[PDB]
Amino acid sequence: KLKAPAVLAYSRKINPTNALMFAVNWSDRDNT
DNA sequence: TTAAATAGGGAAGATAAGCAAAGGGTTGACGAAAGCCCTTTGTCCC
């Protein structure tokens, strides 16, 4: 009947990082 | 070197699988109540 095994797991295929926030101007975004 | 006046309510804490086998565990010493025989000492008889 093709029953699922007792232990079966999958890893994570999309890895984001922790975002960082900075304050800049709309016309001088070079320095943060 | 101050008097008072209070300090949040609600929800919720995951599941599955398994815990090993083999080998050995020491020795010696801790008796009373008589039987017989011999020796010695002492008493008594012949």
PDB file of N, CA and C (backbone and C1' of nucleotides) in Angstrom, chain B residues 1-44:
ATOM      1  P    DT B   1      17.551  66.459  55.499  1.00  0.00           P
ATOM      2  O5'  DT B   1      17.161  66.123  53.985  1.00  0.00           O
ATOM      3  C5'  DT B   1      16.096  66.821  53.352  1.00  0.00           C
ATOM      4  C4'  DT B   1      15.949  66.389  51.904  1.00  0.00           C
ATOM      5  C3'  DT B   1      15.950  64.874  51.675  1.00  0.00           C
ATOM      6  O3'  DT B   1      14.959  64.526  50.718  1.00  0.00           O
ATOM      7  C1'  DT B   1      17.632  65.878  50.368  1.00  0.00           C
ATOM      8  P    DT B   2      13.993  63.268  50.974  1.00  0.00           P
ATOM      9  O5'  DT B   2      12.706  63.906  51.676  1.00  0.00           O
ATOM     10  C5'  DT B   2      11.986  64.946  51.026  1.00  0.00           C
ATOM     11  C4'  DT B   2      10.508  64.870  51.365  1.00  0.00           C
ATOM     12  C3'  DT B   2       9.828  63.576  50.955  1.00  0.00           C
ATOM     13  O3'  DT B   2       8.686  63.354  51.765  1.00  0.00           O
ATOM     14  C1'  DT B   2       9.042  65.344  49.595  1.00  0.00           C
ATOM     15  P    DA B   3       8.561  62.010  52.633  1.00  0.00           P
ATOM     16  O5'  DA B   3       6.990  61.859  52.881  1.00  0.00           O
ATOM     17  C5'  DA B   3       6.138  61.495  51.805  1.00  0.00           C
ATOM     18  C4'  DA B   3       4.912  62.389  51.756  1.00  0.00           C
ATOM     19  C3'  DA B   3       3.841  61.936  50.780  1.00  0.00           C
ATOM     20  O3'  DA B   3       2.938  61.058  51.438  1.00  0.00           O
ATOM     21  C1'  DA B   3       4.318  64.250  50.450  1.00  0.00           C
ATOM     22  P    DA B   4       2.992  59.477  51.153  1.00  0.00           P
ATOM     23  O5'  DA B   4       1.826  59.245  50.088  1.00  0.00           O
ATOM     24  C5'  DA B   4       0.513  59.713  50.365  1.00  0.00           C
ATOM     25  C4'  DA B   4      -0.280  59.883  49.083  1.00  0.00           C
ATOM     26  C3'  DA B   4      -0.377  58.629  48.216  1.00  0.00           C
ATOM     27  O3'  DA B   4      -1.677  58.527  47.655  1.00  0.00           O
ATOM     28  C1'  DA B   4       0.634  60.375  46.980  1.00  0.00           C
ATOM     29  P    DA B   5      -2.428  57.108  47.621  1.00  0.00           P
ATOM     30  O5'  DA B   5      -3.205  57.123  46.222  1.00  0.00           O
ATOM     31  C5'  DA B   5      -2.602  57.722  45.082  1.00  0.00           C
ATOM     32  C4'  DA B   5      -2.405  56.701  43.976  1.00  0.00           C
ATOM     33  C3'  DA B   5      -1.642  55.454  44.390  1.00  0.00           C
ATOM     34  O3'  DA B   5      -2.061  54.339  43.612  1.00  0.00           O
ATOM     35  C1'  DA B   5      -0.338  56.713  42.858  1.00  0.00           C
ATOM     36  P    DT B   6      -2.595  53.008  44.338  1.00  0.00           P
ATOM     37  O5'  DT B   6      -2.586  51.904  43.179  1.00  0.00           O
ATOM     38  C5'  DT B   6      -3.480  52.019  42.080  1.00  0.00           C
ATOM     39  C4'  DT B   6      -2.720  51.995  40.767  1.00  0.00           C
ATOM     40  C3'  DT B   6      -1.797  50.795  40.581  1.00  0.00           C
ATOM     41  O3'  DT B   6      -2.436  49.807  39.782  1.00  0.00           O
ATOM     42  C1'  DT B   6      -0.835  52.868  39.783  1.00  0.00           C
ATOM     43  P    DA B   7      -1.941  48.280  39.839  1.00  0.00           P
ATOM     44  O5'  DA B   7      -0.719  48.231  38.809  1.00  0.00           O
ATOM     45  C5'  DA B   7      -0.945  48.468  37.424  1.00  0.00           C
ATOM     46  C4'  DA B   7       0.305  48.170  36.613  1.00  0.00           C
ATOM     47  C3'  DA B   7       0.949  46.812  36.894  1.00  0.00           C
ATOM     48  O3'  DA B   7       1.359  46.207  35.676  1.00  0.00           O
ATOM     49  C1'  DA B   7       2.531  48.529  37.226  1.00  0.00           C
ATOM     50  P    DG B   8       1.082  44.646  35.414  1.00  0.00           P
ATOM     51  O5'  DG B   8      -0.490  44.576  35.131  1.00  0.00           O
ATOM     52  C5'  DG B   8      -1.060  45.375  34.104  1.00  0.00           C
ATOM     53  C4'  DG B   8      -2.274  44.695  33.497  1.00  0.00           C
ATOM     54  C3'  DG B   8      -1.998  43.322  32.882  1.00  0.00           C
ATOM     55  O3'  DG B   8      -2.368  42.269  33.797  1.00  0.00           O
ATOM     56  C1'  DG B   8      -2.823  44.793  31.217  1.00  0.00           C
ATOM     57  P    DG B   9      -3.899  41.803  33.996  1.00  0.00           P
ATOM     58  O5'  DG B   9      -4.191  40.843  32.750  1.00  0.00           O
ATOM     59  C5'  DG B   9      -5.391  40.081  32.712  1.00  0.00           C
ATOM     60  C4'  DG B   9      -6.254  40.477  31.529  1.00  0.00           C
ATOM     61  C3'  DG B   9      -6.226  39.506  30.366  1.00  0.00           C
ATOM     62  O3'  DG B   9      -7.174  38.470  30.580  1.00  0.00           O
ATOM     63  C1'  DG B   9      -5.993  41.743  29.574  1.00  0.00           C
ATOM     64  P    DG B  10      -6.696  36.937  30.631  1.00  0.00           P
ATOM     65  O5'  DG B  10      -6.723  36.477  29.102  1.00  0.00           O
ATOM     66  C5'  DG B  10      -7.947  36.489  28.380  1.00  0.00           C
ATOM     67  C4'  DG B  10      -7.693  36.370  26.890  1.00  0.00           C
ATOM     68  C3'  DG B  10      -6.763  35.241  26.493  1.00  0.00           C
ATOM     69  O3'  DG B  10      -7.516  34.047  26.316  1.00  0.00           O
ATOM     70  C1'  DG B  10      -6.255  37.263  25.286  1.00  0.00           C
ATOM     71  P    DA B  11      -7.008  32.662  26.953  1.00  0.00           P
ATOM     72  O5'  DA B  11      -6.211  31.964  25.757  1.00  0.00           O
ATOM     73  C5'  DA B  11      -6.885  31.646  24.547  1.00  0.00           C
ATOM     74  C4'  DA B  11      -5.909  31.591  23.386  1.00  0.00           C
ATOM     75  C3'  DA B  11      -4.713  30.685  23.600  1.00  0.00           C
ATOM     76  O3'  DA B  11      -5.046  29.346  23.235  1.00  0.00           O
ATOM     77  C1'  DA B  11      -4.059  32.764  22.592  1.00  0.00           C
ATOM     78  P    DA B  12      -4.828  28.142  24.276  1.00  0.00           P
ATOM     79  O5'  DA B  12      -4.200  26.970  23.386  1.00  0.00           O
ATOM     80  C5'  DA B  12      -3.252  27.278  22.371  1.00  0.00           C
ATOM     81  C4'  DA B  12      -1.951  26.528  22.594  1.00  0.00           C
ATOM     82  C3'  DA B  12      -1.390  26.638  23.992  1.00  0.00           C
ATOM     83  O3'  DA B  12      -0.319  25.714  24.145  1.00  0.00           O
ATOM     84  C1'  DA B  12      -0.240  28.101  22.556  1.00  0.00           C
ATOM     85  P    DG B  13      -0.591  24.182  24.552  1.00  0.00           P
ATOM     86  O5'  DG B  13       0.719  23.428  24.035  1.00  0.00           O
ATOM     87  C5'  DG B  13       1.095  23.520  22.665  1.00  0.00           C
ATOM     88  C4'  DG B  13       2.590  23.760  22.524  1.00  0.00           C
ATOM     89  C3'  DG B  13       3.475  22.876  23.402  1.00  0.00           C
ATOM     90  O3'  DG B  13       4.604  22.433  22.663  1.00  0.00           O
ATOM     91  C1'  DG B  13       3.935  25.152  23.838  1.00  0.00           C
ATOM     92  P    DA B  14       5.182  20.951  22.887  1.00  0.00           P
ATOM     93  O5'  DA B  14       4.967  20.235  21.474  1.00  0.00           O
ATOM     94  C5'  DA B  14       3.658  20.114  20.929  1.00  0.00           C
ATOM     95  C4'  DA B  14       3.669  19.216  19.705  1.00  0.00           C
ATOM     96  C3'  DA B  14       4.459  17.927  19.872  1.00  0.00           C
ATOM     97  O3'  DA B  14       3.597  16.896  20.333  1.00  0.00           O
ATOM     98  C1'  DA B  14       5.135  19.047  17.876  1.00  0.00           C
ATOM     99  P    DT B  15       4.204  15.573  21.011  1.00  0.00           P
ATOM    100  O5'  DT B  15       4.560  14.635  19.766  1.00  0.00           O
ATOM    101  C5'  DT B  15       3.541  14.247  18.852  1.00  0.00           C
ATOM    102  C4'  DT B  15       4.146  13.769  17.546  1.00  0.00           C
ATOM    103  C3'  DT B  15       5.215  12.705  17.695  1.00  0.00           C
ATOM    104  O3'  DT B  15       4.610  11.418  17.691  1.00  0.00           O
ATOM    105  C1'  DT B  15       5.895  14.404  16.131  1.00  0.00           C
ATOM    106  P    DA B  16       5.214  10.235  18.593  1.00  0.00           P
ATOM    107  O5'  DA B  16       6.194   9.460  17.597  1.00  0.00           O
ATOM    108  C5'  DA B  16       5.687   8.909  16.389  1.00  0.00           C
ATOM    109  C4'  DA B  16       6.810   8.655  15.403  1.00  0.00           C
ATOM    110  C3'  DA B  16       7.974   7.857  15.957  1.00  0.00           C
ATOM    111  O3'  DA B  16       7.710   6.467  15.817  1.00  0.00           O
ATOM    112  C1'  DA B  16       8.766   9.750  14.729  1.00  0.00           C
ATOM    113  P    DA B  17       8.093   5.447  16.998  1.00  0.00           P
ATOM    114  O5'  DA B  17       9.606   5.045  16.680  1.00  0.00           O
ATOM    115  C5'  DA B  17       9.926   4.385  15.463  1.00  0.00           C
ATOM    116  C4'  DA B  17      11.428   4.344  15.254  1.00  0.00           C
ATOM    117  C3'  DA B  17      12.229   3.903  16.464  1.00  0.00           C
ATOM    118  O3'  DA B  17      12.315   2.483  16.502  1.00  0.00           O
ATOM    119  C1'  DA B  17      13.197   5.861  15.521  1.00  0.00           C
ATOM    120  P    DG B  18      11.910   1.683  17.836  1.00  0.00           P
ATOM    121  O5'  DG B  18      13.298   1.482  18.600  1.00  0.00           O
ATOM    122  C5'  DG B  18      14.303   0.655  18.034  1.00  0.00           C
ATOM    123  C4'  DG B  18      15.685   1.211  18.322  1.00  0.00           C
ATOM    124  C3'  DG B  18      16.101   1.176  19.778  1.00  0.00           C
ATOM    125  O3'  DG B  18      16.658  -0.094  20.090  1.00  0.00           O
ATOM    126  C1'  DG B  18      16.718   3.251  18.741  1.00  0.00           C
ATOM    127  P    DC B  19      16.527  -0.696  21.574  1.00  0.00           P
ATOM    128  O5'  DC B  19      17.677   0.050  22.398  1.00  0.00           O
ATOM    129  C5'  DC B  19      19.024  -0.016  21.950  1.00  0.00           C
ATOM    130  C4'  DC B  19      19.974   0.536  22.997  1.00  0.00           C
ATOM    131  C3'  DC B  19      19.835  -0.082  24.392  1.00  0.00           C
ATOM    132  O3'  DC B  19      21.120  -0.410  24.902  1.00  0.00           O
ATOM    133  C1'  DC B  19      19.735   2.265  24.534  1.00  0.00           C
ATOM    134  P    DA B  20      21.330  -1.741  25.775  1.00  0.00           P
ATOM    135  O5'  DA B  20      22.326  -2.625  24.892  1.00  0.00           O
ATOM    136  C5'  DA B  20      21.905  -3.127  23.629  1.00  0.00           C
ATOM    137  C4'  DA B  20      22.954  -4.057  23.050  1.00  0.00           C
ATOM    138  C3'  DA B  20      23.674  -4.915  24.076  1.00  0.00           C
ATOM    139  O3'  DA B  20      22.977  -6.142  24.252  1.00  0.00           O
ATOM    140  C1'  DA B  20      25.263  -3.817  22.689  1.00  0.00           C
ATOM    141  P    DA B  21      23.229  -7.032  25.564  1.00  0.00           P
ATOM    142  O5'  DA B  21      24.464  -7.962  25.161  1.00  0.00           O
ATOM    143  C5'  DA B  21      24.377  -8.799  24.016  1.00  0.00           C
ATOM    144  C4'  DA B  21      25.759  -9.191  23.531  1.00  0.00           C
ATOM    145  C3'  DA B  21      26.644  -9.834  24.579  1.00  0.00           C
ATOM    146  O3'  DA B  21      26.393 -11.231  24.636  1.00  0.00           O
ATOM    147  C1'  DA B  21      27.860  -8.169  23.381  1.00  0.00           C
ATOM    148  P    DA B  22      26.504 -12.015  26.034  1.00  0.00           P
ATOM    149  O5'  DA B  22      28.076 -12.211  26.240  1.00  0.00           O
ATOM    150  C5'  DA B  22      28.827 -12.970  25.302  1.00  0.00           C
ATOM    151  C4'  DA B  22      30.309 -12.901  25.619  1.00  0.00           C
ATOM    152  C3'  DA B  22      30.661 -13.141  27.073  1.00  0.00           C
ATOM    153  O3'  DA B  22      30.782 -14.538  27.315  1.00  0.00           O
ATOM    154  C1'  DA B  22      31.904 -11.293  26.181  1.00  0.00           C
ATOM    155  P    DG B  23      30.402 -15.146  28.753  1.00  0.00           P
ATOM    156  O5'  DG B  23      31.725 -14.930  29.622  1.00  0.00           O
ATOM    157  C5'  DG B  23      32.942 -15.550  29.229  1.00  0.00           C
ATOM    158  C4'  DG B  23      34.103 -15.034  30.059  1.00  0.00           C
ATOM    159  C3'  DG B  23      33.822 -14.911  31.542  1.00  0.00           C
ATOM    160  O3'  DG B  23      34.049 -16.162  32.181  1.00  0.00           O
ATOM    161  C1'  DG B  23      34.964 -12.969  30.736  1.00  0.00           C
ATOM    162  P    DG B  24      32.954 -16.770  33.189  1.00  0.00           P
ATOM    163  O5'  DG B  24      33.574 -16.498  34.636  1.00  0.00           O
ATOM    164  C5'  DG B  24      34.836 -17.053  34.980  1.00  0.00           C
ATOM    165  C4'  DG B  24      35.659 -16.058  35.773  1.00  0.00           C
ATOM    166  C3'  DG B  24      35.086 -15.691  37.129  1.00  0.00           C
ATOM    167  O3'  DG B  24      35.513 -16.635  38.102  1.00  0.00           O
ATOM    168  C1'  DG B  24      35.846 -13.739  35.969  1.00  0.00           C
ATOM    169  P    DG B  25      34.472 -17.218  39.179  1.00  0.00           P
ATOM    170  O5'  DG B  25      34.418 -16.092  40.312  1.00  0.00           O
ATOM    171  C5'  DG B  25      35.606 -15.716  40.995  1.00  0.00           C
ATOM    172  C4'  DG B  25      35.317 -14.652  42.038  1.00  0.00           C
ATOM    173  C3'  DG B  25      34.324 -15.065  43.124  1.00  0.00           C
ATOM    174  O3'  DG B  25      34.779 -14.615  44.398  1.00  0.00           O
ATOM    175  C1'  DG B  25      33.557 -13.109  42.041  1.00  0.00           C
ATOM    176  P    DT B  26      34.586 -15.537  45.700  1.00  0.00           P
ATOM    177  O5'  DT B  26      36.023 -16.202  45.928  1.00  0.00           O
ATOM    178  C5'  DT B  26      36.505 -17.180  45.017  1.00  0.00           C
ATOM    179  C4'  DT B  26      37.756 -17.852  45.551  1.00  0.00           C
ATOM    180  C3'  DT B  26      37.687 -18.292  47.022  1.00  0.00           C
ATOM    181  O3'  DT B  26      38.025 -19.666  47.130  1.00  0.00           O
ATOM    182  C1'  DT B  26      39.693 -17.146  46.579  1.00  0.00           C
ATOM    183  P    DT B  27      37.197 -20.628  48.112  1.00  0.00           P
ATOM    184  O5'  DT B  27      38.311 -21.587  48.737  1.00  0.00           O
ATOM    185  C5'  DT B  27      38.792 -21.351  50.054  1.00  0.00           C
ATOM    186  C4'  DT B  27      40.288 -21.100  50.052  1.00  0.00           C
ATOM    187  C3'  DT B  27      40.940 -21.144  51.418  1.00  0.00           C
ATOM    188  O3'  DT B  27      41.270 -22.485  51.750  1.00  0.00           O
ATOM    189  C1'  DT B  27      41.755 -19.286  50.141  1.00  0.00           C
ATOM    190  P    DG B  28      40.472 -23.249  52.918  1.00  0.00           P
ATOM    191  O5'  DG B  28      41.327 -22.940  54.233  1.00  0.00           O
ATOM    192  C5'  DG B  28      42.640 -23.467  54.367  1.00  0.00           C
ATOM    193  C4'  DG B  28      43.396 -22.744  55.466  1.00  0.00           C
ATOM    194  C3'  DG B  28      42.619 -22.562  56.755  1.00  0.00           C
ATOM    195  O3'  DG B  28      42.799 -23.702  57.587  1.00  0.00           O
ATOM    196  C1'  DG B  28      43.726 -20.527  56.133  1.00  0.00           C
ATOM    197  P    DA B  29      41.563 -24.306  58.418  1.00  0.00           P
ATOM    198  O5'  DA B  29      41.654 -23.563  59.829  1.00  0.00           O
ATOM    199  C5'  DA B  29      42.814 -23.714  60.638  1.00  0.00           C
ATOM    200  C4'  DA B  29      42.869 -22.633  61.698  1.00  0.00           C
ATOM    201  C3'  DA B  29      41.576 -22.429  62.462  1.00  0.00           C
ATOM    202  O3'  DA B  29      41.522 -23.323  63.566  1.00  0.00           O
ATOM    203  C1'  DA B  29      42.534 -20.325  61.826  1.00  0.00           C
ATOM    204  P    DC B  30      40.259 -24.297  63.759  1.00  0.00           P
ATOM    205  O5'  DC B  30      39.879 -24.130  65.301  1.00  0.00           O
ATOM    206  C5'  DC B  30      38.530 -23.899  65.678  1.00  0.00           C
ATOM    207  C4'  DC B  30      38.401 -22.595  66.441  1.00  0.00           C
ATOM    208  C3'  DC B  30      36.989 -22.057  66.552  1.00  0.00           C
ATOM    209  O3'  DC B  30      36.328 -22.652  67.655  1.00  0.00           O
ATOM    210  C1'  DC B  30      38.524 -20.305  66.002  1.00  0.00           C
ATOM    211  P    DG B  31      34.800 -23.124  67.519  1.00  0.00           P
ATOM    212  O5'  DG B  31      34.834 -24.664  67.944  1.00  0.00           O
ATOM    213  C5'  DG B  31      35.522 -25.057  69.124  1.00  0.00           C
ATOM    214  C4'  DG B  31      34.738 -26.117  69.875  1.00  0.00           C
ATOM    215  C3'  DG B  31      35.393 -26.608  71.168  1.00  0.00           C
ATOM    216  O3'  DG B  31      34.410 -26.748  72.182  1.00  0.00           O
ATOM    217  C1'  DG B  31      34.944 -28.436  69.762  1.00  0.00           C
ATOM    218  P    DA B  32      34.742 -26.331  73.697  1.00  0.00           P
ATOM    219  O5'  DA B  32      33.736 -27.218  74.565  1.00  0.00           O
ATOM    220  C5'  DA B  32      32.337 -27.135  74.331  1.00  0.00           C
ATOM    221  C4'  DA B  32      31.665 -28.470  74.595  1.00  0.00           C
ATOM    222  C3'  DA B  32      31.967 -29.088  75.960  1.00  0.00           C
ATOM    223  O3'  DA B  32      30.788 -29.669  76.499  1.00  0.00           O
ATOM    224  C1'  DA B  32      32.613 -30.587  74.246  1.00  0.00           C
ATOM    225  P    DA B  33      30.738 -30.111  78.043  1.00  0.00           P
ATOM    226  O5'  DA B  33      30.966 -31.691  77.995  1.00  0.00           O
ATOM    227  C5'  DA B  33      30.079 -32.512  77.246  1.00  0.00           C
ATOM    228  C4'  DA B  33      30.583 -33.943  77.196  1.00  0.00           C
ATOM    229  C3'  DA B  33      31.151 -34.472  78.515  1.00  0.00           C
ATOM    230  O3'  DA B  33      30.675 -35.791  78.760  1.00  0.00           O
ATOM    231  C1'  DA B  33      32.719 -34.770  76.793  1.00  0.00           C
ATOM    232  P    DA B  34      30.702 -36.393  80.248  1.00  0.00           P
ATOM    233  O5'  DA B  34      32.264 -36.518  80.584  1.00  0.00           O
ATOM    234  C5'  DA B  34      32.867 -37.795  80.784  1.00  0.00           C
ATOM    235  C4'  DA B  34      33.006 -38.552  79.473  1.00  0.00           C
ATOM    236  C3'  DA B  34      34.008 -39.687  79.496  1.00  0.00           C
ATOM    237  O3'  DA B  34      33.408 -40.854  80.040  1.00  0.00           O
ATOM    238  C1'  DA B  34      34.270 -38.406  77.510  1.00  0.00           C
ATOM    239  P    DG B  35      34.191 -41.720  81.145  1.00  0.00           P
ATOM    240  O5'  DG B  35      35.049 -42.755  80.280  1.00  0.00           O
ATOM    241  C5'  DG B  35      34.389 -43.719  79.475  1.00  0.00           C
ATOM    242  C4'  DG B  35      35.348 -44.347  78.480  1.00  0.00           C
ATOM    243  C3'  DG B  35      36.687 -44.764  79.052  1.00  0.00           C
ATOM    244  O3'  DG B  35      36.581 -46.033  79.684  1.00  0.00           O
ATOM    245  C1'  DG B  35      36.991 -43.666  76.967  1.00  0.00           C
ATOM    246  P    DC B  36      37.517 -46.386  80.942  1.00  0.00           P
ATOM    247  O5'  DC B  36      38.976 -46.545  80.304  1.00  0.00           O
ATOM    248  C5'  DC B  36      39.240 -47.612  79.402  1.00  0.00           C
ATOM    249  C4'  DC B  36      40.537 -47.381  78.646  1.00  0.00           C
ATOM    250  C3'  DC B  36      41.776 -47.259  79.508  1.00  0.00           C
ATOM    251  O3'  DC B  36      42.257 -48.550  79.863  1.00  0.00           O
ATOM    252  C1'  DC B  36      41.797 -45.629  77.766  1.00  0.00           C
ATOM    253  P    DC B  37      43.136 -48.742  81.195  1.00  0.00           P
ATOM    254  O5'  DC B  37      44.546 -48.080  80.827  1.00  0.00           O
ATOM    255  C5'  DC B  37      45.359 -48.661  79.815  1.00  0.00           C
ATOM    256  C4'  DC B  37      46.511 -47.742  79.443  1.00  0.00           C
ATOM    257  C3'  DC B  37      47.362 -47.272  80.604  1.00  0.00           C
ATOM    258  O3'  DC B  37      48.323 -48.264  80.940  1.00  0.00           O
ATOM    259  C1'  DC B  37      46.917 -45.467  79.115  1.00  0.00           C
ATOM    260  P    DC B  38      48.956 -48.302  82.417  1.00  0.00           P
ATOM    261  O5'  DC B  38      49.985 -47.078  82.428  1.00  0.00           O
ATOM    262  C5'  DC B  38      51.107 -47.087  81.555  1.00  0.00           C
ATOM    263  C4'  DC B  38      51.772 -45.722  81.508  1.00  0.00           C
ATOM    264  C3'  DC B  38      52.139 -45.140  82.856  1.00  0.00           C
ATOM    265  O3'  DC B  38      53.386 -45.665  83.293  1.00  0.00           O
ATOM    266  C1'  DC B  38      51.158 -43.470  81.463  1.00  0.00           C
ATOM    267  P    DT B  39      53.731 -45.723  84.861  1.00  0.00           P
ATOM    268  O5'  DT B  39      54.091 -44.209  85.230  1.00  0.00           O
ATOM    269  C5'  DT B  39      55.194 -43.569  84.601  1.00  0.00           C
ATOM    270  C4'  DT B  39      55.169 -42.072  84.851  1.00  0.00           C
ATOM    271  C3'  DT B  39      55.047 -41.665  86.304  1.00  0.00           C
ATOM    272  O3'  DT B  39      56.325 -41.686  86.924  1.00  0.00           O
ATOM    273  C1'  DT B  39      53.607 -40.337  84.943  1.00  0.00           C
ATOM    274  P    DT B  40      56.451 -41.984  88.498  1.00  0.00           P
ATOM    275  O5'  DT B  40      56.004 -40.610  89.184  1.00  0.00           O
ATOM    276  C5'  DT B  40      56.742 -39.421  88.931  1.00  0.00           C
ATOM    277  C4'  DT B  40      55.966 -38.197  89.381  1.00  0.00           C
ATOM    278  C3'  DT B  40      55.479 -38.239  90.815  1.00  0.00           C
ATOM    279  O3'  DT B  40      56.515 -37.825  91.695  1.00  0.00           O
ATOM    280  C1'  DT B  40      53.758 -37.432  89.377  1.00  0.00           C
ATOM    281  P    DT B  41      56.580 -38.401  93.194  1.00  0.00           P
ATOM    282  O5'  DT B  41      55.433 -37.593  93.962  1.00  0.00           O
ATOM    283  C5'  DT B  41      55.512 -36.179  94.065  1.00  0.00           C
ATOM    284  C4'  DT B  41      54.194 -35.597  94.543  1.00  0.00           C
ATOM    285  C3'  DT B  41      53.608 -36.260  95.772  1.00  0.00           C
ATOM    286  O3'  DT B  41      54.200 -35.724  96.947  1.00  0.00           O
ATOM    287  C1'  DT B  41      51.910 -35.888  94.142  1.00  0.00           C
ATOM    288  P    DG B  42      54.425 -36.661  98.233  1.00  0.00           P
ATOM    289  O5'  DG B  42      52.958 -36.822  98.849  1.00  0.00           O
ATOM    290  C5'  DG B  42      52.274 -35.683  99.356  1.00  0.00           C
ATOM    291  C4'  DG B  42      50.815 -36.001  99.628  1.00  0.00           C
ATOM    292  C3'  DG B  42      50.564 -37.294 100.376  1.00  0.00           C
ATOM    293  O3'  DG B  42      50.708 -37.087 101.775  1.00  0.00           O
ATOM    294  C1'  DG B  42      49.067 -37.115  98.543  1.00  0.00           C
ATOM    295  P    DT B  43      51.017 -38.330 102.746  1.00  0.00           P
ATOM    296  O5'  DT B  43      49.593 -39.029 102.940  1.00  0.00           O
ATOM    297  C5'  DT B  43      48.531 -38.315 103.562  1.00  0.00           C
ATOM    298  C4'  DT B  43      47.223 -39.079 103.452  1.00  0.00           C
ATOM    299  C3'  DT B  43      47.288 -40.531 103.882  1.00  0.00           C
ATOM    300  O3'  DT B  43      47.154 -40.632 105.293  1.00  0.00           O
ATOM    301  C1'  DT B  43      46.080 -40.334 101.843  1.00  0.00           C
ATOM    302  P    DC B  44      47.929 -41.789 106.095  1.00  0.00           P
ATOM    303  O5'  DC B  44      47.086 -43.110 105.776  1.00  0.00           O
ATOM    304  C5'  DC B  44      45.749 -43.226 106.248  1.00  0.00           C
ATOM    305  C4'  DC B  44      45.074 -44.459 105.671  1.00  0.00           C
ATOM    306  C3'  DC B  44      45.878 -45.740 105.771  1.00  0.00           C
ATOM    307  O3'  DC B  44      45.707 -46.327 107.053  1.00  0.00           O
ATOM    308  C1'  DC B  44      44.922 -45.540 103.603  1.00  0.00           C
TER     309       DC B  44
END
